């Protein structure tokens, strides 16, 4: 192949294109679900004021 910044051939790895080739923004595929209170399953809920 050729070096980056080769004198005759334009490549995306050349320095002149740095910061024009931005990734597309994706969702978080690795998110854990939100935790929830465990005590509120087992204990009785009482009318409170």
């Amino acid at each position: 192949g050729f070096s980056a910044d080769h004198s005759q051939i334009a490549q995306t790895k050349d320095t002149m294109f740095t910061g024009y080739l931005d990734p597309v923004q994706a969702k978080d595929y690795f998110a854990e679900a939100e935790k929830t209170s465990i005590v509120q399953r087992v204990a009785q809920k009482i009318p409170m004021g």
Partner: protein
């Protein structure tokens, strides 16, 4: 509000005069990133309700 980027051109692109069978020359451009970010200017003034 994001600011702007400008691809400033800097390359000496070139072409040549050519006969019938003369095989043609090869050339390449050049560029630089330039950028602009907004900044605030602000002031406050105060008075009695009267």
């Amino acid at each position: 509000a994001t600011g702007i980027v400008i691809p400033h051109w800097t390359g000496d692109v070139s072409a040549q005069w050519i006969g019938e069978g003369d095989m043609k020359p090869i050339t390449k451009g050049n560029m630089t990133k330039r950028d602009v970010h907004p900044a605030k200017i602000a002031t406050i003034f105060v008075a009695s309700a009267e």
